[PDB]
Each structure stands twice: as C-alpha cells, then as structure tokens.
Amino acid sequence: PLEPTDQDLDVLLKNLGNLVTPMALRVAATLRLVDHLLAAGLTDTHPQALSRLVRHLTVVGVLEGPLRPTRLGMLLADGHPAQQRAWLDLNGAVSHADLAFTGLLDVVRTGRPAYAGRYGRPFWEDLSADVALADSFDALMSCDEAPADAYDWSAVRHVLDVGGGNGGMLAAIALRAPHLRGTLVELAGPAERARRRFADAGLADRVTVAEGDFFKPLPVTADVVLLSFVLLNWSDEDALTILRGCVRALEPGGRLLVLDRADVEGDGADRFFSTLLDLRMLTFMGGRVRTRDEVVDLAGSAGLALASERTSGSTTLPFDFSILEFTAVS
Amino acid sequence: EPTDQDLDVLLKNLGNLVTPMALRVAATLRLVDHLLAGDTLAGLADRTDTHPQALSRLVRHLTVVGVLEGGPLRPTRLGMLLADGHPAQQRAWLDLNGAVSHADLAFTGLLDVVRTGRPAYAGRYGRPFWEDLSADVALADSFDALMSCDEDLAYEAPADAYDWSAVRHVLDVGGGNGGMLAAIALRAPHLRGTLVELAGPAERARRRFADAGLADRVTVAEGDFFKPLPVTADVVLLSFVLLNWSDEDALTILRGCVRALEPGGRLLVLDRADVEGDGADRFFSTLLDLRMLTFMGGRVRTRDEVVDLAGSAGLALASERTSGSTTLPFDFSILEFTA
Ligand SMILES: CC[C@]1(O)Cc2c(O)c3c(c(O)c2[C@@H](O[C@H]2C[C@H](N)[C@H](O)[C@H](C)O2)C1)C(=O)c1c(OC)cccc1C3=O
Ligand SMILES: CC[C@]1(O)Cc2c(O)c3c(c(O)c2[C@@H](O[C@H]2C[C@H](N)[C@H](O)[C@H](C)O2)C1)C(=O)c1c(OC)cccc1C3=O
Ligand SMILES: Nc1ncnc2c1ncn2[C@@H]1O[C@H](CSCC[C@H](N)C(=O)O)[C@@H](O)[C@H]1O
Ligand SMILES: Nc1ncnc2c1ncn2[C@@H]1O[C@H](CSCC[C@H](N)C(=O)O)[C@@H](O)[C@H]1O
C-alpha cells in the first residue's frame, strides 16, 4: 500500500484540491487589480476584505510588497499576449461558464451539461440572448489563420464553412486565394458578425453568409467543407449528424477539413489541456474532445476516409491542434 | 516579464478551477476506496452509479494530474490521500456531501464577498451557514464529524500541555462533540467538566461521555454562547470558536466567558494566531481566513489581534504555547488569559 508524503499532501492542499485560489485569481482579474495598481482608495471593494484577498494573492505568488505584481502577476496585465486577465474575467464567457463546474457531480453521474442548471439557458442559447457574453466569447476565441496557410487553395474553387463563427477563418482563406468562392453557415448571432466582416474586407461579391442550422441539410454544395472546432461541441450522435450533412454537401472529389484537437500517441501535445478542454465541453454543453483515432472512426461511420493530417496551434497559448482531411469513400 | 513556466503555473495550478472540482467529485464517489476493494472501468461505474463515459473522462483527467494511474486502474501514492482511512481525512473534507466542501462551492460568489464584506453561503444556499446546519441534519452531522475526528491528535493539545492537578471544573464553550474535554478529563481524574454546545453536537457529546465511563463527572448543556453561560468554572476553553465570528460577535462570546470565570480562573483560547517570528505557512492562514469570511463572515486573527480583542473583554494574556495538527501542516496557538 502506497503511503502519501508531506509533499503529496502539500500538492493536494495548495494545488489539486484548492478551489479558493482559482476564485481569488478570477476576482483579481475581474477587479483589474494588476492593471488598476499600475496606475482604501482601491476599485469599489470593501477595504478590509480586499486586503484579506491581497494577503492570499501575495502568498500564492501573484503580488508582492511597495505593492507590485510579480513576474507571474504580469499575466493579469491587460497587455499580455496570452490575455489571461480576459480569460479569467468573471464577466467573460469562459470564466462565467467555468463556475458551472460546481455542478460537476451531476455531470459525471449523468453525462448531461451543467451550464443551463446554473444559468437557465444552454450555452449557445445564452450567448445569443446575452450580447455581453457573446462579445466576450468572440474576443477570447478570435484573438490571433491556420487553414489559410496550411492548405493548397489553388486546386479549390468553393469553400463552405459550417459553423464558421464570425467568418474570420473563411475571410483569411478568401483573401489568400482571390479566385475562391465561399459560403458560411451559422446561427444568426455569428452570421451577422460574418456578414459585416465580409463586407468590410471587400469580399461580399464572392463570400456569402447562409444563415441556418447545420442539423438541417446544408443549402449549397462545395468542393471543400470546413468544420473548425465544431465537432468537439457535440455528442457522438450529434457529431455524426453534422458529418453526414457535410458529406452530403461534398462535390465529386471534394475534401472535408476538420480542425480540432485530435491527440496522437507520441505527439508532443500536453494531455492536461486535452482533458481540461474535454471536461469543459462535457460540463458546458455535453460535447467531447476526441483523439485522432476517434475522429477517424466517427468520420468512417459517415462515409469518409482520412486523406491527410497536419498540425498547427495557438500563437499565444500552449495549445496545438490538427487539420484532418477526409474524402468520401464512394 | 512572464516566462513560459509562469503561464504553465497559472493554467494548471493557480487559475485552475476544473481539477479541484474533479478531486471533490472523486472523493464524493469514493473512487479510490472502490479501486482498493477491487478494477475495470464499467465496474467502477456500476459501483458508483455514474455515467460510464463521463466517469472515464473524469478518470482520464485524474490520471493526467497524478491521482490515478493504470488502466490496472489504481490510486497513485498521492491518490492514496483519498483513501477513506488516511489520517489527514482529505476524502471527507473534499466530499461534496460534507459541510466543508459543500460550503466551498459558495466561493463562486467571492466577487461579492470582496465588494461587500458579507459571506457568500446564503447567496448560494438560501440561508446562512449556521442556520443551514441547524435545519439540515445530515450537513450538521458531517461537519461535527469533520471537527471531531480522532485521527488528528490536536484535540489532546490542552490535556498534554496544561497542568490540571489543581483545576476543579472545566467549561468547554462550543466544544464540539466533546473530544477535547474527554481528553482532559481522562488525564485529570479529579476534574469536573461541562460542555456547552448546539443541540446536534451536544447530544453526540452526551453519547461520547456515556460510552467512555465519564458521565458522572462530565455533563453536557445544550446552549447558546451568545446567551449567559449556565455554570461557572475555574478553566474555560474556547477551541477554534472565535475565528468563526466578527469582532463584535467574538467579543460577546469573550465577555460571556469572562463572567463564567471563577475568581482567579483561566481562559484557554485555541486558535490560529500568527506571529511574525514564527514560521507557520501563511498559505493556510490566508486560506482559512478566506473560508471564514466567505462562509460566515468570520476572521482569522493574529496573536496580537486576539490579545487585543481579549483585552477589550477584560483579559490579560498569562502564557502562550505553540501546538499543531499531527496530520495536516497546521500549527496553532494555546493562549491563556486571566481576568
Ligand atoms: C484547454 C485550454 C485552452 O487554452 C482554453 C480553451 C477554452 O477554455 C475553450 C475553448 C478552447 O478551444 C480553448 C483552447 O484555447 C484556445 C484554442 C483555440 N483553438 C483557439 O486558439 C483559442 C485561443 O482558444 C484551449 C473552446 O473552444 C470553447 C468552445 O468552443 C466553441 C465553446 C465553449 C467554451 C470553450 C472554451 O472554454
Ligand atoms: C487549513 C487546514 C485546516 O485543516 C483547514 C480547516 C478548515 O478548512 C476549516 C476549519 C478548520 O478548523 C480548519 C483547521 O482544522 C483545525 C481546527 C480544529 N481544531 C480541528 O479539530 C482540526 C484538528 O484542526 C485547519 C473550520 O474550523 C471551519 C469551520 O468551523 C466552524 C466552519 C466552516 C469551515 C471550516 C473550515 O473550512
Ligand atoms: N445548429 C447550429 N447551426 C449552425 N451553427 C451552429 C449551430 N450551433 C452552434 N453553431 C455555431 O458553432 C460554432 C462553434 S465555435 C466557432 C468555431 C469557428 N468555426 C472558429 O474556428 O472560430 C459557434 O459559432 C456557433 O454559432
Ligand atoms: N450559538 C452557539 N452556541 C454554542 N455553540 C455554537 C454556537 N454556534 C456555533 N457553535 C459551535 O461552535 C463550534 C465551532 S467548531 C468546533 C470547535 C471545537 N471546540 C473543536 O476544537 O473541535 C461548533 O461545534 C458549533 O456547534
């Protein structure tokens, strides 16, 4: 029988089971403490309570002092590229969603998401009704592609981007390859952002917005179909529905590109972020992060065979991902 | 100038809200205990009545962070902390059916706490902490059990550190289910004892003293320590009570104990009371301080702060000694006061 050491207990108490310190980091972010300090009178907070928070933040290595952030505390500076202050801000969509993890017990007992239980509407319904949440989710997901540079667009003519958000990805591709036509299928919230983006980029004559629902048949065919960070939002059954719609819209010899986190044994990818994202998808909306082999197996159920595979990743966060290219089997 | 390791620390540790909830779900489901009695994944799911694919995704996260390995699926060395018999009792403290981890979930309201100075517990659970315990019996039971666990010998600290040969009557004010008082009584067979507590702990203490052979000299009085105390005594004990309360409420309790003190009596205060010299881990000072604030509006006080508060109630410090948990990294102080 293994015997925990004092260091194991330390790790459990200060790190793995510590719920207080992540909330203290979020409250600090939401208070812009690091920023508002690079500027009693401190925030709209109760001063003795704020001092008690800062004592904690000092001990865990965020602040020090002449009260100053540490080298680590400079991650909550609004200027830092990794944008952790916005990620942690309690008014933003991700931190707001993170609080639903206090319902993790029912999630694990049932596999059903917790988001609506804390807040009333499902995730996407909530983003559509709450402009503030939608705006912040937009800014976290769209700061700083991949397919525009990874893929040979000279042999493509029409790209259909299924659930392509505010059209950022489709715009990068279309600016890159002036000969391309494009269609974006999205819900009304993101459909309008993308409409405005395409008109601003001088793309409206060849890149169109087809507002709709990717659980219905797609309105057009194309020789490249893009699914960028869509499948991980959905259960296996829903994800198979989406993929079959995509297959139906593929033209002869067309290709389907799935951009997603798709782990391979022995790639360099940090499995912590794999599981963190996987539990977020489970808890926020009942999705699931799938490995390379699981995506390939699900795509095979939809009549697709893997043609090629490429990797990319974030330029401000420690997160690598893949682009998987599929062809129709017959 | 943040390094790459800095960002790793923020994402995996300091800002990570997911892993601590996974630990609490793991403890609640007793996963490690099920693994230690015999494993497969689907068997684990049936013994825990959980969704099989969701449990597998929880276990994969637990594997990555070092609580589980295998899958044969088994606890790591660190994961053995979640075995129900481990002396530090972290499975029970993390159990979402127990009072402490239940209250921890109110930390989602920490923003309001820093804005207003008021606790978050009622904002989540409808009524404040002590109110909720008196109305929810299973919650109240789990809390008393967490406080009274005898794996940690901290409860023997007064019995071992103090000289009881001349003491005639000890009054333990808020003494839980009586563990501390029983320890003193067993070391000083001449002594008489009185315990004042809420209805739940008071009956658990009545049972303790009966089973121990102590009922003839240690009596229990269900009471409110915001109301005059029912007996006087030459030693009064206040063990980890004051930190649950605001300065105004703590002072009312202290004044109540003063009036209970017989002439030349001693008040013993056990609490966490940091001193700038000492080497006690300020992580646990601040963590417990934010829990008292968030759960009930309490405050962890330094030694100077306790001594100042006691001086307002008419008490001067006679002596001070360090003690500590024998299972957790948690030193504390025994502060002796005289009128
Ligand atoms: C695992 C740690 C992570 O850094 C944080 C994170 C994250 O918290 C979420 C999502 C993520 O993709 C990620 C990843 O971070 C990056 C990856 C993206 N490719 C993109 O580069 C952007 C910068 O976010 C990983 C989502 O994709 C997401 C979502 O998809 C529509 C819906 C709701 C919540 C999240 C959600 O909370
Ligand atoms: C930080 C490490 C620690 O284990 C954590 C801890 C703690 O988290 C809490 C409480 C603690 O007392 C403690 C400390 O435990 C001490 C106090 C007792 N004499 C007890 O018998 C034990 C042997 O040592 C220390 C409470 O006492 C408490 C409470 O008291 C009424 C009400 C709500 C939450 C806590 C609460 O969360
Ligand atoms: N039934 C549905 N039909 C079409 N789009 C949907 C949808 N349900 C969710 N979505 C869209 O799915 C998207 C997932 S996230 C946006 C990912 C985007 N392609 C990118 O890489 O940046 C959201 O924009 C959401 O509006
Ligand atoms: N109004 C009140 N009157 C009497 N006891 C109270 C009380 N409010 C809270 N308490 C008791 O205060 C105690 C604080 S925690 C238990 C501390 C105990 N002396 C020990 O060292 O183990 C709890 O047992 C709780 O029941």
mmCIF file with all atom_site columns, N, CA and C and ligand atoms in Angstrom, chain A residues 124 137 141 161-165 169 185-187 190 212-215 228-230 233-234, ligand 3:
data_model
loop_
_atom_site.group_PDB
_atom_site.id
_atom_site.type_symbol
_atom_site.label_atom_id
_atom_site.label_alt_id
_atom_site.label_comp_id
_atom_site.label_asym_id
_atom_site.label_entity_id
_atom_site.label_seq_id
_atom_site.pdbx_PDB_ins_code
_atom_site.Cartn_x
_atom_site.Cartn_y
_atom_site.Cartn_z
_atom_site.occupancy
_atom_site.B_iso_or_equiv
_atom_site.pdbx_formal_charge
_atom_site.auth_seq_id
_atom_site.auth_comp_id
_atom_site.auth_asym_id
_atom_site.auth_atom_id
_atom_site.pdbx_PDB_model_num
ATOM   1  N N   . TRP A 1 124 ? -25.192 28.001 -26.066 1.00 0.00 ? 124 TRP A N   1
ATOM   2  C CA  . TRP A 1 124 ? -25.360 28.784 -27.287 1.00 0.00 ? 124 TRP A CA  1
ATOM   3  C C   . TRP A 1 124 ? -26.584 29.686 -27.203 1.00 0.00 ? 124 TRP A C   1
ATOM   4  N N   . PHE A 1 137 ? -17.090 36.058 -25.538 1.00 0.00 ? 137 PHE A N   1
ATOM   5  C CA  . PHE A 1 137 ? -16.697 34.779 -26.125 1.00 0.00 ? 137 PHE A CA  1
ATOM   6  C C   . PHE A 1 137 ? -16.015 34.984 -27.464 1.00 0.00 ? 137 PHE A C   1
ATOM   7  N N   . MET A 1 141 ? -12.086 33.640 -28.316 1.00 0.00 ? 141 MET A N   1
ATOM   8  C CA  . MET A 1 141 ? -11.882 32.640 -29.363 1.00 0.00 ? 141 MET A CA  1
ATOM   9  C C   . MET A 1 141 ? -11.179 33.198 -30.594 1.00 0.00 ? 141 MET A C   1
ATOM   10 N N   . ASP A 1 161 ? -18.019 26.847 -45.104 1.00 0.00 ? 161 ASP A N   1
ATOM   11 C CA  . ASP A 1 161 ? -17.560 26.825 -43.717 1.00 0.00 ? 161 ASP A CA  1
ATOM   12 C C   . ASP A 1 161 ? -18.774 26.619 -42.820 1.00 0.00 ? 161 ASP A C   1
ATOM   13 N N   . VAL A 1 162 ? -18.867 25.439 -42.231 1.00 0.00 ? 162 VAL A N   1
ATOM   14 C CA  . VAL A 1 162 ? -20.044 25.038 -41.481 1.00 0.00 ? 162 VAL A CA  1
ATOM   15 C C   . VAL A 1 162 ? -19.818 25.389 -40.017 1.00 0.00 ? 162 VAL A C   1
ATOM   16 N N   . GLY A 1 163 ? -20.660 26.273 -39.491 1.00 0.00 ? 163 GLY A N   1
ATOM   17 C CA  . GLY A 1 163 ? -20.418 26.847 -38.182 1.00 0.00 ? 163 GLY A CA  1
ATOM   18 C C   . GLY A 1 163 ? -19.107 27.602 -38.073 1.00 0.00 ? 163 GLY A C   1
ATOM   19 N N   . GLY A 1 164 ? -18.824 28.478 -39.040 1.00 0.00 ? 164 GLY A N   1
ATOM   20 C CA  . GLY A 1 164 ? -17.556 29.182 -39.065 1.00 0.00 ? 164 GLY A CA  1
ATOM   21 C C   . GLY A 1 164 ? -17.460 30.463 -38.248 1.00 0.00 ? 164 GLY A C   1
ATOM   22 N N   . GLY A 1 165 ? -18.263 30.587 -37.193 1.00 0.00 ? 165 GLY A N   1
ATOM   23 C CA  . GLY A 1 165 ? -18.205 31.767 -36.337 1.00 0.00 ? 165 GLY A CA  1
ATOM   24 C C   . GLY A 1 165 ? -18.384 33.074 -37.088 1.00 0.00 ? 165 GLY A C   1
ATOM   25 N N   . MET A 1 169 ? -11.951 32.843 -40.137 1.00 0.00 ? 169 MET A N   1
ATOM   26 C CA  . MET A 1 169 ? -11.228 31.815 -40.876 1.00 0.00 ? 169 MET A CA  1
ATOM   27 C C   . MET A 1 169 ? -11.532 31.876 -42.367 1.00 0.00 ? 169 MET A C   1
ATOM   28 N N   . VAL A 1 185 ? -22.168 29.031 -43.077 1.00 0.00 ? 185 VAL A N   1
ATOM   29 C CA  . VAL A 1 185 ? -23.431 28.647 -42.460 1.00 0.00 ? 185 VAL A CA  1
ATOM   30 C C   . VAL A 1 185 ? -23.289 28.854 -40.965 1.00 0.00 ? 185 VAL A C   1
ATOM   31 N N   . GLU A 1 186 ? -24.140 29.705 -40.392 1.00 0.00 ? 186 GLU A N   1
ATOM   32 C CA  . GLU A 1 186 ? -24.048 29.979 -38.961 1.00 0.00 ? 186 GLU A CA  1
ATOM   33 C C   . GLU A 1 186 ? -25.408 30.359 -38.391 1.00 0.00 ? 186 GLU A C   1
ATOM   34 N N   . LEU A 1 187 ? -25.496 30.325 -37.062 1.00 0.00 ? 187 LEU A N   1
ATOM   35 C CA  . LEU A 1 187 ? -26.634 30.902 -36.362 1.00 0.00 ? 187 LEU A CA  1
ATOM   36 C C   . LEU A 1 187 ? -26.613 32.421 -36.507 1.00 0.00 ? 187 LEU A C   1
ATOM   37 N N   . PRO A 1 190 ? -23.658 34.928 -34.854 1.00 0.00 ? 190 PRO A N   1
ATOM   38 C CA  . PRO A 1 190 ? -22.408 34.962 -35.626 1.00 0.00 ? 190 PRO A CA  1
ATOM   39 C C   . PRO A 1 190 ? -22.605 35.260 -37.108 1.00 0.00 ? 190 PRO A C   1
ATOM   40 N N   . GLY A 1 212 ? -28.370 29.589 -41.033 1.00 0.00 ? 212 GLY A N   1
ATOM   41 C CA  . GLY A 1 212 ? -29.058 28.316 -41.000 1.00 0.00 ? 212 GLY A CA  1
ATOM   42 C C   . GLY A 1 212 ? -28.615 27.465 -39.831 1.00 0.00 ? 212 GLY A C   1
ATOM   43 N N   . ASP A 1 213 ? -28.817 26.159 -39.981 1.00 0.00 ? 213 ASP A N   1
ATOM   44 C CA  . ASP A 1 213 ? -28.706 25.204 -38.890 1.00 0.00 ? 213 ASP A CA  1
ATOM   45 C C   . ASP A 1 213 ? -28.014 23.975 -39.451 1.00 0.00 ? 213 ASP A C   1
ATOM   46 N N   . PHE A 1 214 ? -26.823 23.643 -38.935 1.00 0.00 ? 214 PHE A N   1
ATOM   47 C CA  . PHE A 1 214 ? -26.118 22.534 -39.568 1.00 0.00 ? 214 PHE A CA  1
ATOM   48 C C   . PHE A 1 214 ? -26.665 21.170 -39.161 1.00 0.00 ? 214 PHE A C   1
ATOM   49 N N   . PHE A 1 215 ? -27.786 21.120 -38.433 1.00 0.00 ? 215 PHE A N   1
ATOM   50 C CA  . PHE A 1 215 ? -28.532 19.879 -38.273 1.00 0.00 ? 215 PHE A CA  1
ATOM   51 C C   . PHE A 1 215 ? -29.555 19.666 -39.383 1.00 0.00 ? 215 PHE A C   1
ATOM   52 N N   . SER A 1 228 ? -14.387 23.705 -38.332 1.00 0.00 ? 228 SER A N   1
ATOM   53 C CA  . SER A 1 228 ? -13.313 24.196 -37.479 1.00 0.00 ? 228 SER A CA  1
ATOM   54 C C   . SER A 1 228 ? -13.826 24.317 -36.052 1.00 0.00 ? 228 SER A C   1
ATOM   55 N N   . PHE A 1 229 ? -13.379 23.415 -35.183 1.00 0.00 ? 229 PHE A N   1
ATOM   56 C CA  . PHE A 1 229 ? -13.731 23.467 -33.773 1.00 0.00 ? 229 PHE A CA  1
ATOM   57 C C   . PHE A 1 229 ? -15.242 23.502 -33.588 1.00 0.00 ? 229 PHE A C   1
ATOM   58 N N   . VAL A 1 230 ? -15.909 22.615 -34.319 1.00 0.00 ? 230 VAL A N   1
ATOM   59 C CA  . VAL A 1 230 ? -17.338 22.387 -34.203 1.00 0.00 ? 230 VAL A CA  1
ATOM   60 C C   . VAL A 1 230 ? -17.625 21.052 -33.520 1.00 0.00 ? 230 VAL A C   1
ATOM   61 N N   . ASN A 1 233 ? -17.933 20.366 -29.818 1.00 0.00 ? 233 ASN A N   1
ATOM   62 C CA  . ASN A 1 233 ? -19.068 20.885 -29.067 1.00 0.00 ? 233 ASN A CA  1
ATOM   63 C C   . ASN A 1 233 ? -20.184 19.864 -28.903 1.00 0.00 ? 233 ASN A C   1
ATOM   64 N N   . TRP A 1 234 ? -20.084 18.685 -29.516 1.00 0.00 ? 234 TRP A N   1
ATOM   65 C CA  . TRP A 1 234 ? -21.251 17.829 -29.669 1.00 0.00 ? 234 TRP A CA  1
ATOM   66 C C   . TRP A 1 234 ? -20.968 16.378 -29.286 1.00 0.00 ? 234 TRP A C   1
HETATM 67 N N1  . LIG C 2 .   ? -27.182 24.420 -35.039 1.00 0.00 ? 3   LIG C N1  1
HETATM 68 C C1  . LIG C 2 .   ? -26.045 25.241 -35.391 1.00 0.00 ? 3   LIG C C1  1
HETATM 69 N N2  . LIG C 2 .   ? -26.023 25.551 -36.681 1.00 0.00 ? 3   LIG C N2  1
HETATM 70 C C2  . LIG C 2 .   ? -25.022 26.315 -37.174 1.00 0.00 ? 3   LIG C C2  1
HETATM 71 N N3  . LIG C 2 .   ? -24.053 26.765 -36.348 1.00 0.00 ? 3   LIG C N3  1
HETATM 72 C C3  . LIG C 2 .   ? -24.070 26.440 -35.032 1.00 0.00 ? 3   LIG C C3  1
HETATM 73 C C4  . LIG C 2 .   ? -25.064 25.691 -34.547 1.00 0.00 ? 3   LIG C C4  1
HETATM 74 N N4  . LIG C 2 .   ? -24.863 25.510 -33.225 1.00 0.00 ? 3   LIG C N4  1
HETATM 75 C C5  . LIG C 2 .   ? -23.740 26.156 -32.887 1.00 0.00 ? 3   LIG C C5  1
HETATM 76 N N5  . LIG C 2 .   ? -23.253 26.727 -34.002 1.00 0.00 ? 3   LIG C N5  1
HETATM 77 C C6  . LIG C 2 .   ? -22.062 27.515 -34.117 1.00 0.00 ? 3   LIG C C6  1
HETATM 78 O O1  . LIG C 2 .   ? -20.942 26.709 -33.830 1.00 0.00 ? 3   LIG C O1  1
HETATM 79 C C7  . LIG C 2 .   ? -19.920 27.500 -33.629 1.00 0.00 ? 3   LIG C C7  1
HETATM 80 C C8  . LIG C 2 .   ? -18.881 26.749 -32.739 1.00 0.00 ? 3   LIG C C8  1
HETATM 81 S S1  . LIG C 2 .   ? -17.477 27.820 -32.325 1.00 0.00 ? 3   LIG C S1  1
HETATM 82 C C9  . LIG C 2 .   ? -16.966 28.784 -33.771 1.00 0.00 ? 3   LIG C C9  1
HETATM 83 C C10 . LIG C 2 .   ? -15.817 27.988 -34.364 1.00 0.00 ? 3   LIG C C10 1
HETATM 84 C C11 . LIG C 2 .   ? -15.329 28.721 -35.605 1.00 0.00 ? 3   LIG C C11 1
HETATM 85 N N6  . LIG C 2 .   ? -15.524 27.903 -36.795 1.00 0.00 ? 3   LIG C N6  1
HETATM 86 C C12 . LIG C 2 .   ? -13.860 29.079 -35.390 1.00 0.00 ? 3   LIG C C12 1
HETATM 87 O O2  . LIG C 2 .   ? -12.957 28.245 -35.703 1.00 0.00 ? 3   LIG C O2  1
HETATM 88 O O3  . LIG C 2 .   ? -13.568 30.195 -34.872 1.00 0.00 ? 3   LIG C O3  1
HETATM 89 C C13 . LIG C 2 .   ? -20.472 28.799 -32.987 1.00 0.00 ? 3   LIG C C13 1
HETATM 90 O O4  . LIG C 2 .   ? -20.128 29.858 -33.769 1.00 0.00 ? 3   LIG C O4  1
HETATM 91 C C14 . LIG C 2 .   ? -21.991 28.579 -33.029 1.00 0.00 ? 3   LIG C C14 1
HETATM 92 O O5  . LIG C 2 .   ? -22.728 29.779 -33.527 1.00 0.00 ? 3   LIG C O5  1
#
